[PDB]
Amino acid sequence: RVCPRILLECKKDSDCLAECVCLEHGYCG
């Protein structure tokens, strides 16, 4: 699944939305 192109800063990758991950620097890939 692809996650919309929306910036998102978080610690735990799980925090991310859809089927993506959260990056330490502060961005969801």
Question: The tokens 């991310």 sit on which residue?
Answer: 16
Torsion angle in degrees (nearest 10) through CA of 12, 10, 15, 28: -110
Q: Which domain holds residue 21?
A: 1-29
Sequence-separated (6 or more) residues with CB below 8 Å from residue 2: 18, 19, 20
Task: Look at residues 29, 3, 25, 19 and name the one whose alpha carbon lies nearest to residue 11.
Answer: 25
Token readout for 26 is 């502060």
Per the CB < 8 A criterion, the answer to whether 25 and 17 are in contact is no
CA 26 from centroid of its chain's CA atoms: 8
Sequence-separated (6 or more) residues with CB below 8 Å from residue 9: 22, 23, 25, 26, 27, 28
- Phi then psi for residue 27, to 5 deg, are -170, 140
| CA gap 18, 8 in Å, rounded | 12
Q: Give the count of domains, the chain.
A: 1
Which ranges of 1-29 does DSSP label H, i.e. alpha helix?
none
